[PDB]
Amino acid sequence: ARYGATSTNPAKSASARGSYLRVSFKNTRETAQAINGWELTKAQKYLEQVLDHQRAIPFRRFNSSIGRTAQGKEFGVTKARWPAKSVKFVQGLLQNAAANAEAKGLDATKLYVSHIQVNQAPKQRRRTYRAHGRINKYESSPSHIELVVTEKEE
Amino acid sequence: SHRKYEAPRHGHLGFLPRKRAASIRARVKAFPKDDRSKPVALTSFLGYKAGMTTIVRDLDRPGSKFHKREVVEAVTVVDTPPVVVVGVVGYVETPRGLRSLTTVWAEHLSDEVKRRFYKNWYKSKKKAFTKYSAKYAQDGAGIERELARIKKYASVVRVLVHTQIRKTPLAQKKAHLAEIQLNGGSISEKVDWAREHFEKTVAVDSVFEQNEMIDAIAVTKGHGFEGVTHRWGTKKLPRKTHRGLRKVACIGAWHPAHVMWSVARAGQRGYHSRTSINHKIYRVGKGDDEANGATSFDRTKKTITPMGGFVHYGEIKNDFIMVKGCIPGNRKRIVTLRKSLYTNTSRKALEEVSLKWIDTASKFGKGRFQTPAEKHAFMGTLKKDL
RNA sequence: AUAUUGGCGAGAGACCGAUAGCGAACAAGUACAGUGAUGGAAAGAUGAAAAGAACUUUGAAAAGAGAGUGAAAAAGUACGUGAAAUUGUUGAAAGGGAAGGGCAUUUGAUCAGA
RNA sequence: GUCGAAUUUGGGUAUAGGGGCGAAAGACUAAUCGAACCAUCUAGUAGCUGGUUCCUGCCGAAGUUUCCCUCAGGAUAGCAG
RNA sequence: AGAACUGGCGAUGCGGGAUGAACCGAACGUAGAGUUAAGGUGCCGGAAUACACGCUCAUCAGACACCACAAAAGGUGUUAG
RNA sequence: GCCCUGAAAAUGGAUGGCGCUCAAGCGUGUUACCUAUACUCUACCGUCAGGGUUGAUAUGAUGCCCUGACGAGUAGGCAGGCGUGGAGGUCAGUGACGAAGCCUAGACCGUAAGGUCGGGUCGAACGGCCUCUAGUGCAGAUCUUGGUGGUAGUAGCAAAUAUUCAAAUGAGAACUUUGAAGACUGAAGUGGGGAAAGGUUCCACGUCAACAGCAGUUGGACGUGGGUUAGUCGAUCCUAAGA
RNA sequence: GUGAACAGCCUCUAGUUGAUAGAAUAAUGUAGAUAAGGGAAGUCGGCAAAAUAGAUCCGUAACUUCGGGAUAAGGAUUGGC
RNA sequence: AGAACUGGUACGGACAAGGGGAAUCUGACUGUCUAAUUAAAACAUAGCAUUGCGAUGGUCAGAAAGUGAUGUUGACGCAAU
RNA sequence: CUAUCUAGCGAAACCACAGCCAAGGGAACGGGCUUGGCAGAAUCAGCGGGGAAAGAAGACCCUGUUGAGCUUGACUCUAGU
RNA sequence: GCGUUGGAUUGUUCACCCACUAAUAGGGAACGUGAGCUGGGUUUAGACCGUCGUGAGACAGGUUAGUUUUACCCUACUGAU
RNA sequence: UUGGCGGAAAGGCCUUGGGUGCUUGCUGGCGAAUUGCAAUGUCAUUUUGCGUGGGGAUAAAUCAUUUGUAUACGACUUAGA
Ligand SMILES: [K+]
Ligand SMILES: [Mg+2]
Ligand SMILES: [Mg+2]
Ligand SMILES: [Mg+2]
Ligand SMILES: [Mg+2]
Ligand SMILES: [Mg+2]
Ligand SMILES: [Mg+2]
Ligand SMILES: [Mg+2]
Ligand SMILES: [Mg+2]
Ligand SMILES: [Mg+2]
Ligand SMILES: [Mg+2]
Ligand SMILES: [Mg+2]
Ligand SMILES: [Mg+2]
Ligand SMILES: [Mg+2]
Ligand SMILES: [Mg+2]
Ligand SMILES: [Mg+2]
Ligand SMILES: [Mg+2]
Ligand SMILES: [Mg+2]
Ligand SMILES: [Mg+2]
Ligand SMILES: [Mg+2]
Ligand SMILES: [Mg+2]
Ligand SMILES: [Mg+2]
Ligand SMILES: [Mg+2]
Ligand SMILES: [Mg+2]
Ligand SMILES: [Mg+2]
Ligand SMILES: [Mg+2]
Ligand SMILES: [Mg+2]
Ligand SMILES: [Mg+2]
Ligand SMILES: [Mg+2]
Ligand SMILES: [Mg+2]
Ligand SMILES: [Mg+2]
Ligand SMILES: [Mg+2]
Ligand SMILES: [Mg+2]
Ligand SMILES: [Mg+2]
Ligand SMILES: [Mg+2]
Ligand SMILES: [Mg+2]
Ligand SMILES: [Mg+2]
Ligand SMILES: [Mg+2]
Ligand SMILES: [Mg+2]
Ligand SMILES: [Mg+2]
Ligand SMILES: [Mg+2]
Ligand SMILES: [Mg+2]
Ligand SMILES: [Mg+2]
Ligand SMILES: [Mg+2]
Ligand SMILES: [Mg+2]
Ligand SMILES: [Mg+2]
Ligand SMILES: [Mg+2]
Ligand SMILES: [Mg+2]
Ligand SMILES: [Mg+2]
Ligand SMILES: [Mg+2]
Ligand SMILES: [Mg+2]
Ligand SMILES: [Mg+2]
Ligand SMILES: [Mg+2]
Ligand SMILES: [Mg+2]
Ligand SMILES: [Mg+2]
Ligand SMILES: [Mg+2]
Ligand SMILES: [Mg+2]
Ligand SMILES: [Mg+2]
Ligand SMILES: [Mg+2]
Ligand SMILES: [Mg+2]
Ligand SMILES: [Mg+2]
Ligand SMILES: [Mg+2]
Ligand SMILES: [Mg+2]
Ligand SMILES: [Mg+2]
Ligand SMILES: [Mg+2]
Ligand SMILES: [Mg+2]
Ligand SMILES: [Mg+2]
Ligand SMILES: [Mg+2]
Ligand SMILES: [Mg+2]
Ligand SMILES: [Mg+2]
Ligand SMILES: [Mg+2]
Ligand SMILES: [Mg+2]
Ligand SMILES: [Mg+2]
Ligand SMILES: [Mg+2]
Ligand SMILES: [Mg+2]
Ligand SMILES: [Mg+2]
Ligand SMILES: [Mg+2]
Ligand SMILES: [Mg+2]
Ligand SMILES: [Mg+2]
Ligand SMILES: [Mg+2]
Ligand SMILES: [Mg+2]
Ligand SMILES: [Mg+2]
Ligand SMILES: [Mg+2]
Ligand SMILES: [Mg+2]
Ligand SMILES: [Mg+2]
Ligand SMILES: [Mg+2]
């Protein structure tokens, strides 16, 4: 429990989280922001299309010197990617949230991603060897991912 | 300190930036000065560069070492089917330049030109100009009112013409639409000519004539990102050079503490708009005219098409303009041929050229025969046929 | 009678309170490095009590959502509290080649005193 | 370059720091050599470089005299509290 | 580069000299009002496109000391002796 | 006198800029006007000085009050204060009905060091005053230790010819296994054994949190076990340089 | 097997198929190459590269310590049957 | 070793594999060194020459020794250049 | 084969704050200050003008009453003889 | 505005000569330009010679050999969204 | 409502006829107060949203696929009911 700041009704919402997931934090942040606020089924279809390279995840903050693609145009950006590992983790948490909403008795057809946040887990440390007998860090940037889907209402 | 040895700078600073042209059809940025006593006529034409061949002609140049002798010259063939007039644009002069006041279109537009207004033609409803065609409902009152405005104003008149790209061997299938200034004064009758030619074709022979010096406006062949050595013609650095030698060694002095615009840098090469002038028309050939590639000395009944077809283009089945030399742009590219902006009387112009022979051998190799009949005559009977 | 940074047994302190105090509050002269002489760390705290999360559900699983234990899970062994740098989300605001600041007031938000 | 003898090389063994060893470069002597490494003397000395942690109030300089193995320092008088 | 007297900067902000350690003015607790210094009053920019007598036309005019340069020699240019 | 010639330097640029020609230029004169932390007056703060006031209810005579003048400041000196760890006394101080700590573009007080309060979090001690004491205040020291960024999802993971198809397993297969194919080491091997060294890496089963700079169901990994059989092979014995 | 050959190249037994991959084919690179005519004019300097190359036969100068120089130089031939 | 025949005159057809000549300076040569910027003309070398010494000795070690290297040696030797 | 784009993986140097110019003055070569020119999000591949770019408390020079290697009838000694 | 060269010698700037040419003008830009190159010279350590010095060593005296590191950041520029 | 003129950015100017409201050109009748002695004492136009009625119309672009006149990636150029 104790997710990030939310403003939705806990009785109309369902939560899902994953901690210390060995997936890139920056890629997963971009993936989460790509579906923040989307309807659940639309977001899942979009993630499947991202995995199929039919649509892309726009990279807005962590995008320096990444590359350009025509698939960022629908988001009004030139820089977009297809972070498959992040997408897979996100859709796993999305299906977990959908299962929790079904167990809570929420209407799956009104579910939208009312909250999704990715922050940095503790780094997993490895070593890389460099010229002239030097050693540098080779750490991972794992993620804590949390999301809550809420029934759309008025 | 000084350069320590003088040399001219590499490249022309008047052709900057060396960027991609904004459009594949190079813009006509200047039309011939209007002579308002002449009949109304087009000042340019649209064609497609088909390819190059070579010709033989008797040089008429008194005082030259080759006077009254045979010379072999390279020529470029531009396939120029007649262009269809589909509109007229009126241009009023303003303290801020020329300004289009209104455009009057033809009632019926072919699918060739309608495709130009669509990015996705196959899945569109083809609604373009469907409400505009209703302006011609009973008497065309709105059309006549707009034409009357063009007559009452619009000191400069241009017609909208489009190519018949379906008559070319190109797969593009989407016509090229361009504005051509109407020279021949009485703006009233400029508009009258445009309206009377609405939906009608204009043949290249009504614009251009034999021996006339014309200008070719086209986007050059693109070559992508290029280094300084070929983009600008700078000296190759010695073999000993660390970090590469296809570079410019000094891209600037310490001060100004900036790379200057005049220093050669790596970047895009080609796909630039170029207006090259003074290309003499060697032939105004007609599409329906069999023996197109024949002359009064050759008499071999052959078309202008080389054996096996123009490489990467196809066969010439339409009217064509054969100009001396080469013109910017590659084969299949739209090129605008425009009348010269001045009167050339240098005895290079005003020369009347008479072709003696036109090469129709294959450009797909070391072509040996001008015609299949000549190939049969030389080779005899083969096993497969002939 | 005098000395005593060793050994053994005691009593104390206006001393230090885990980067301090012996290097070592803990399997510390340990792990580890060096051929060797030698060099030599880091590392304390759930909770009164494991009562350390039965059971259900999603997932291949890790885990999640519940349920539950507990005074508290804003104590879940990655455990007392839980700063800052740095980061995510939400909310607010501003943004023509920095940002930040001083005086003054407009506007928005917020608030004390009477 | 050299490649059948002043050849290359394993193992054993000997030579240890102002010492060894050197077909000699101050070369090599465990990534250390115009004096190895380790610990201690040792928190070595430094007129030289860097830093030197709260507020407010009042007063408020000197780069000048003489002497010094003195000239990037000090003593002395002067200025200041 | 080295001396003499004084005033300063260092140690000093403030108004002016666009800008500047030293120049000009003036030295400073926190505020209000008035008046000024040096400097300015076409606009930037607060303040007269004020008043008055003349001089200058520059195909490199000139426009406030320190200060950011100009000389000898010349000109029926023009003005006054 | 003004103007002009004399009068040539390097990025494009400087009466400060624009611009200005009976000037907005030059020389001169007269007024009006603008504004400094300067002058004048007043208020407040502090400092210094000179005084008045123990005649009581006057508990603050280092107190209260009156008067005048003054206020720049590095190095530096002095004074009055703020804050921290611990100590003696005291407030029979605060506190599990919540101490300390922390967060808080919420409030109050002080010129300030700082102090106080509200709210949230939290869980066991802590504070005011009079004094004592010091390992007592950090922005720097290429400061020490630890942690964390931008760079940046960037540089890059390109030597050693080269991989491909299907099936099985598996949640997941470019990388595991099998089969088929294509290749290489080409006997001075990428083969088969050993010496030094390592020490279980050998083998089997289970198994993938970490490691194998991609992956992984695989492994020299992880977990549990099994395995090294000598009169004849070595050591042991001999002596060598030497110890 | 070719070949003088433990050279280079291909193959047999044995072993491996292990190097992060996929898609494109810009500049500039790293490595490998070619180039008309000229032939060191480049450059400090032929650096780099090219040219020559095995074997058989012919022929081989100055100088010389008589041993060499020497594969001097310079030429011809090479397959298959 | 020779002959005939034969072919796009190719043929050490891949692989493999000297460029050569005329001279100057320098070191005779083979060899050796600055491991990690200097391979050389530097060092060494054979050859030549000088020096000391007949053991109660020459040269050189050791703090000292009833100690030691040359020396299991003896001038055709050892030691120092 | 890179570079490029993608999936996975994923550092380091450096970093007062940062990053458009011209002139001025200024510690006499400004990214900031003054006066002008100007100035429109977010970016990709290259590039080597600039950041008096980074790498190192300049190795050159000087100073220090700071050393060390080496030399010599420097001063003062000393093993040996 | 436009051009101002090809070479022999020298590391050379400079110089000189050959030659073509319309001409072979002078200069600046951190004596422009080394994260552009190169490293011939100078200017570390090796070595030789001459002179000097008793010597270690000295020599704008000559000679030979002697590692030229990093851009992925910002701007500027070139192109591209 | 009749008609004309105006294209430099016209988007406005002029004009015909009738209807209709006001008319302070002149003469009257009624009302105003207490906003308390002032407090802009709210009278304008800029966009947007929403609801109620009426009028009008019934598409494209991009991704994906494809082309190569293009290209590092974007982009460009093509084709596809
Ligand atoms: K030394
Ligand atoms: Mg970028
Ligand atoms: Mg890149
Ligand atoms: Mg490495
Ligand atoms: Mg190593
Ligand atoms: Mg020049
Ligand atoms: Mg060309
Ligand atoms: Mg090189
Ligand atoms: Mg051809
Ligand atoms: Mg400790
Ligand atoms: Mg703890
Ligand atoms: Mg609690
Ligand atoms: Mg933690
Ligand atoms: Mg905690
Ligand atoms: Mg924080
Ligand atoms: Mg910008
Ligand atoms: Mg030496
Ligand atoms: Mg000390
Ligand atoms: Mg004072
Ligand atoms: Mg003395
Ligand atoms: Mg000093
Ligand atoms: Mg000073
Ligand atoms: Mg002053
Ligand atoms: Mg000035
Ligand atoms: Mg004004
Ligand atoms: Mg004069
Ligand atoms: Mg003058
Ligand atoms: Mg003025
Ligand atoms: Mg005047
Ligand atoms: Mg005042
Ligand atoms: Mg007093
Ligand atoms: Mg003071
Ligand atoms: Mg203490
Ligand atoms: Mg509390
Ligand atoms: Mg805060
Ligand atoms: Mg407790
Ligand atoms: Mg302390
Ligand atoms: Mg600190
Ligand atoms: Mg400080
Ligand atoms: Mg630091
Ligand atoms: Mg640190
Ligand atoms: Mg990369
Ligand atoms: Mg690489
Ligand atoms: Mg490989
Ligand atoms: Mg593989
Ligand atoms: Mg297999
Ligand atoms: Mg091979
Ligand atoms: Mg093979
Ligand atoms: Mg095994
Ligand atoms: Mg891995
Ligand atoms: Mg893995
Ligand atoms: Mg095991
Ligand atoms: Mg035996
Ligand atoms: Mg054989
Ligand atoms: Mg050639
Ligand atoms: Mg040739
Ligand atoms: Mg030749
Ligand atoms: Mg030459
Ligand atoms: Mg040359
Ligand atoms: Mg030369
Ligand atoms: Mg060579
Ligand atoms: Mg020969
Ligand atoms: Mg010879
Ligand atoms: Mg030799
Ligand atoms: Mg030999
Ligand atoms: Mg070396
Ligand atoms: Mg070498
Ligand atoms: Mg010698
Ligand atoms: Mg500048
Ligand atoms: Mg200057
Ligand atoms: Mg700067
Ligand atoms: Mg400015
Ligand atoms: Mg670069
Ligand atoms: Mg630079
Ligand atoms: Mg220094
Ligand atoms: Mg130093
Ligand atoms: Mg001294
Ligand atoms: Mg000494
Ligand atoms: Mg220079
Ligand atoms: Mg440079
Ligand atoms: Mg360099
Ligand atoms: Mg240079
Ligand atoms: Mg050199
Ligand atoms: Mg040297
Ligand atoms: Mg001598
Ligand atoms: Mg010298």
mmCIF file of C-alpha atoms (C1' of nucleotides) in Angstrom, chain B residues 20 94-96 99 115-116 118-120 122-123 125-127 149 152-153 172-174 222-225 268 271 330-333, chain K residues 5-11 57-65 67-81:
data_model
loop_
_atom_site.group_PDB
_atom_site.id
_atom_site.type_symbol
_atom_site.label_atom_id
_atom_site.label_comp_id
_atom_site.label_asym_id
_atom_site.label_seq_id
_atom_site.Cartn_x
_atom_site.Cartn_y
_atom_site.Cartn_z
ATOM 1 C CA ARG B 20 17.710 20.149 -50.027
ATOM 2 C CA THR B 94 1.676 46.017 -54.127
ATOM 3 C CA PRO B 95 4.232 48.061 -52.155
ATOM 4 C CA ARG B 96 4.997 44.629 -50.622
ATOM 5 C CA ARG B 99 0.236 39.313 -54.666
ATOM 6 C CA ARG B 115 -4.193 13.529 -57.459
ATOM 7 C CA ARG B 116 -1.863 16.483 -56.827
ATOM 8 C CA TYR B 118 -4.279 14.343 -52.269
ATOM 9 C CA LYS B 119 -1.687 12.619 -50.108
ATOM 10 C CA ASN B 120 -3.840 9.450 -49.983
ATOM 11 C CA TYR B 122 -6.842 5.699 -53.219
ATOM 12 C CA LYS B 123 -8.818 6.023 -49.966
ATOM 13 C CA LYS B 125 -13.719 10.475 -51.493
ATOM 14 C CA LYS B 126 -12.295 12.582 -54.361
ATOM 15 C CA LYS B 127 -14.316 15.618 -53.275
ATOM 16 C CA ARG B 149 -11.818 41.043 -61.339
ATOM 17 C CA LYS B 152 -9.928 44.958 -63.723
ATOM 18 C CA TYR B 153 -6.779 44.261 -61.666
ATOM 19 C CA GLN B 172 4.162 8.365 -60.608
ATOM 20 C CA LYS B 173 0.668 8.855 -62.082
ATOM 21 C CA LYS B 174 0.357 12.168 -60.189
ATOM 22 C CA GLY B 222 20.633 14.197 -54.783
ATOM 23 C CA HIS B 223 23.656 12.534 -53.215
ATOM 24 C CA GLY B 224 22.815 12.651 -49.503
ATOM 25 C CA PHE B 225 25.338 13.672 -46.883
ATOM 26 C CA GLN B 268 24.049 17.590 -48.104
ATOM 27 C CA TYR B 271 18.926 18.011 -54.701
ATOM 28 C CA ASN B 330 18.340 13.323 -63.397
ATOM 29 C CA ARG B 331 16.134 11.124 -65.566
ATOM 30 C CA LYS B 332 12.392 10.966 -64.721
ATOM 31 C CA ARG B 333 12.612 14.352 -62.951
ATOM 32 C "C1'" C K 5 -17.484 53.631 -56.656
ATOM 33 C "C1'" G K 6 -13.201 51.704 -53.936
ATOM 34 C "C1'" G K 7 -7.880 45.751 -54.572
ATOM 35 C "C1'" A K 8 -2.084 49.091 -51.674
ATOM 36 C "C1'" A K 9 -3.966 46.032 -46.422
ATOM 37 C "C1'" A K 10 -10.061 47.000 -50.966
ATOM 38 C "C1'" G K 11 -13.887 45.230 -45.827
ATOM 39 C "C1'" A K 57 -22.096 21.155 -45.435
ATOM 40 C "C1'" U K 58 -21.482 15.585 -45.061
ATOM 41 C "C1'" A K 59 -13.547 15.274 -45.402
ATOM 42 C "C1'" A K 60 -8.872 14.408 -44.715
ATOM 43 C "C1'" A K 61 -3.976 13.672 -42.600
ATOM 44 C "C1'" U K 62 -0.676 10.431 -40.207
ATOM 45 C "C1'" C K 63 0.979 5.419 -38.634
ATOM 46 C "C1'" A K 64 1.415 0.711 -41.097
ATOM 47 C "C1'" U K 65 2.494 -1.365 -46.448
ATOM 48 C "C1'" U K 67 8.212 3.309 -54.517
ATOM 49 C "C1'" G K 68 13.742 5.163 -55.164
ATOM 50 C "C1'" U K 69 13.762 10.620 -59.057
ATOM 51 C "C1'" A K 70 15.336 10.517 -51.835
ATOM 52 C "C1'" U K 71 17.750 9.280 -47.677
ATOM 53 C "C1'" A K 72 22.383 8.551 -41.435
ATOM 54 C "C1'" C K 73 17.458 8.707 -38.645
ATOM 55 C "C1'" G K 74 13.721 11.971 -39.382
ATOM 56 C "C1'" A K 75 12.482 14.005 -43.898
ATOM 57 C "C1'" C K 76 11.459 13.741 -49.477
ATOM 58 C "C1'" U K 77 9.243 11.502 -53.659
ATOM 59 C "C1'" U K 78 5.612 7.601 -55.340
ATOM 60 C "C1'" A K 79 1.645 3.643 -55.390
ATOM 61 C "C1'" G K 80 -2.365 0.943 -53.148
ATOM 62 C "C1'" A K 81 -10.594 0.044 -51.687
#
